[PDB]
Design a binder for this molecule. Structure first.
Ligand SMILES: Nc1ncnc2c1ncn2[C@@H]1O[C@H](COP(=O)(O)OP(=O)(O)OP(=O)(O)O)[C@@H](O)[C@H]1O
Ligand SMILES: [Mg+2]
Lengths: 498, 62, 53
């Protein structure tokens, strides 16, 4: 009954205003690109609209016609159609109204659930913040993966890169990072809350549905936006989705809040851009990618800044995901994005199958911030762990004397310590406890195949009996002398009793 | 506002639909066939329990 | 809310009230009969083993 009534409520308010608008006739439509004739005052990369309510962007301004890319399906545009200029550069809704909503590349709700109540709009193609607004990266972005929080730490405002082959565990790292922020977002202080944005480019709708249901299960859509430009979405949408998500995150950083955006992948935005550019007839380049393929990404990843306290203090981290071919990191787009970003996280299939998951190749993975953007406890412990693994990797290819035998033992113990499961990120203090137990020669007595057991068991013990110690480590943010003595006695007692 | 003849025309066809909805008008067999299809799908996905009152458990001690 | 989005609010109200009235059972200590064992120990470690030692 009231269903029809709320249906009427929609008619009750319409768009009576018909205006005198500039137009153009579609000389030629084919392959997703229209060649409009007219639109004399249409701007560059403006948003135009077609007679069927379908949008497009005027990308080419040639003397005789305007090359327009259609944001949607192309079968509905005929020749001699009508294109009306909307007089507005391409822009997307922004605000907290988008949190928990799945939206398409243009900010249209995609999961039903009504419309977006956004009260503001932001242009996708905005220039990056200057040199003066920024400030060096200070806080840590807690990822939950032990091997990332310890060996390749990520700060807030950094631009890490997750690069690997197909099916090595990149989206898994992204989802673990998203899920971990629940503990901070549930708390009270607003200086730790991190709103997450996930841009899904070229992924089939089933994958994004699995991902969204996984976030819902972990109750992580309270603060997540999902911008999906899946495979069946015209190339002009997969091209533009990263920029839409980056605007949704620029809104957060511009208002003193913190945001995390995860492009997934950028190697598919590159392909969509190449298709667009080849269908506008622009000359190809190397591997057929346009010449402006580096710019495409550099202008996009340069928006992940760390504003100083005069500009709000907000930040915007970025975790672009690249996909290499058989580990050929030396390809074109991989090298471009490698020389654009800060750190990197190399996932390798030889490590994925050898049992090391996440496959993070700690030997090659880097993080320019390194020291900074790491908690003092983690800084204390992960340093010694890093040295121990660095020494171990040198003498690992084989498998005598007591010193090097114990060095290999410690290396292997730490290696089996760094493993982890899926969608179970650990609090930083728990990581510190586990890594401390491992690196203070305690596990050297145990067999390596059993280490995982210990790990799990140990936490389930400390998480109940010694909540006070973990709270101490979190609050004070360091392993004080008394905290160290406690940790020592807890580990010594637990090891024997197990 | 009393001028948009299409506006009031849509509102009028609305009012007629409101009054005539004693049973889904112009339903056709597709109406019932669908209704049945997704009702059965939802029933299968949810469960087969006593879909009326609270079924009882009667557990077993350790 | 669950009652505010259902046509038969009465049926869900009845569900709610039956939930309010009906609770759940709890297990006991019959499986814990190992109680007896403790008493037996009170003989060895304190009467037989202790005295002989
Ligand atoms: N830490 C882990 N422990 C166990 N299994 C893992 C882990 N990380 C990833 N996997 C496994 O790897 C598979 C692929 O994961 P994921 O989708 O994260 O990789 P991907 O490279 O994003 O895949 P694609 O690139 O094809 O989307 C999953 O099926 C998952 O079971
Ligand atoms: Mg993936």
């Amino acid at each position: 009954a009231e269903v029809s009534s709320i249906l009427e409520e929609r008619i009750l308010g319409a768009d009576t205003s018909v205006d005198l608008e500039e137009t153009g006739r579609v000389l030629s439509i084919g392959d997703g690109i229209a060649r409009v004739h007219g639109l004399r005052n249409v701007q560059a990369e403006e948003m135009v609209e077609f007679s069927s309510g379908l949008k497009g962007m005027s990308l080419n301004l040639e003397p005789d016609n305007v090359g327009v890319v259609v944001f949607g399906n192309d079968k509905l545009i005929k020749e001699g159609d009508i294109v009306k200029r909307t007089g507005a550069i391409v822009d997307v809704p922004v605000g907290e109204e988008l949190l928990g909503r799945v939206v398409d590349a243009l900010g249209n709700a995609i999961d039903g659930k009504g419309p977006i109540g956004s009260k503001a709009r932001r242009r996708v193609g905005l220039k990056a913040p200057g040199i003066i607004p920024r400030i060096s990266v200070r806080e840590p972005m807690q990822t939950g993966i032990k091997a990332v929080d310890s060996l390749v730490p990520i700060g807030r405002g950094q631009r890490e890169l997750i690069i690997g082959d197909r099916q090595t565990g990149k989206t898994s790292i992204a989802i673990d990072t998203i899920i971990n922020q629940k503990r901070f977002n549930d708390g009270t202080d607003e200086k730790k809350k991190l709103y997450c944005i996930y841009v899904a480019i070229g992924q089939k709708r089933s994958t994004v549905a699995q991902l969204v249901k996984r976030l819902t299960d972990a109750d992580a859509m309270k603060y997540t936006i999902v911008v999906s430009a899946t495979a069946s979405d015209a190339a002009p949408l997969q091209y533009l989705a990263p920029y839409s998500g980056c605007s949704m995150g620029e809104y957060f950083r511009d208002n003193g809040k913190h945001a995390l955006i995860i492009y997934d992948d950028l190697s598919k935005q590159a392909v969509a851009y190449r298709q667009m550019s080849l269908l506008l007839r622009r000359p190809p380049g190397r591997e057929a990618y346009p010449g402006d393929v580096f710019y495409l990404h550099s202008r996009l990843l340069e928006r992940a800044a760390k504003m100083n306290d005069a500009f709000g203090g907000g930040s915007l981290t970025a975790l672009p995901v690249i996909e290499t071919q058989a580990g050929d990191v030396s390809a074109y787009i991989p090298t471009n994005v490698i020389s654009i970003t800060d750190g990197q996280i190399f996932l390798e299939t030889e490590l994925f199958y050898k049992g090391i998951r996440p496959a993070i190749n700690v030997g090659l993975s880097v993080s320019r911030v390194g020291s900074a953007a790491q908690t003092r406890a983690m800084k204390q412990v992960a340093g010694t762990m890093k040295l121990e693994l660095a020494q171990y990797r040198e003498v690992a290819a084989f498998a005598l004397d007591a010193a090097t035998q114990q060095l290999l033992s410690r290396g292997v113990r730490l290696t089996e310590l760094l493993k982890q499961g899926q969608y179970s990120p650990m609090a930083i203090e728990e990581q510190v406890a586990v890594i401390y137990a491992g690196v203070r020669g305690y596990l050297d007595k145990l067999e390596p195949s059993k280490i995982t057991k210990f790990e799990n068991a140990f936490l389930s013990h400390v998480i109940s009996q010694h909540q006070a110690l973990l709270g101490k480590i979190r609050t004070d943010g360091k392993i004080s002398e008394e905290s160290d003595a406690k940790l020592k006695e807890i580990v010594t007692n637990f090891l024997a009793g197990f | 506002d009393p001028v948009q003849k299409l506006f009031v025309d849509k509102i009028r066809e609305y009012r007629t639909k409101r009054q005539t909805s004693g049973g889904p008008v112009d339903a056709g067999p597709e109406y019932q066939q669908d209704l049945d299809r997704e009702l059965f799908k939802l029933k299968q996905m949810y469960g087969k329990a006593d879909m009326n009152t609270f079924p009882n458990f009667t557990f077993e001690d350790p | 809310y669950y009652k505010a989005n259902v046509a038969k609010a009465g049926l869900v109200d009845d569900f709610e009230k039956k939930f309010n009235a009906l609770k759940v059972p709890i297990p006991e200590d019959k499986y814990t009969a190992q109680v007896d064992a403790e008493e037996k120990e009170d003989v060895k470690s304190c009467a037989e083993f202790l005295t002989q030692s």
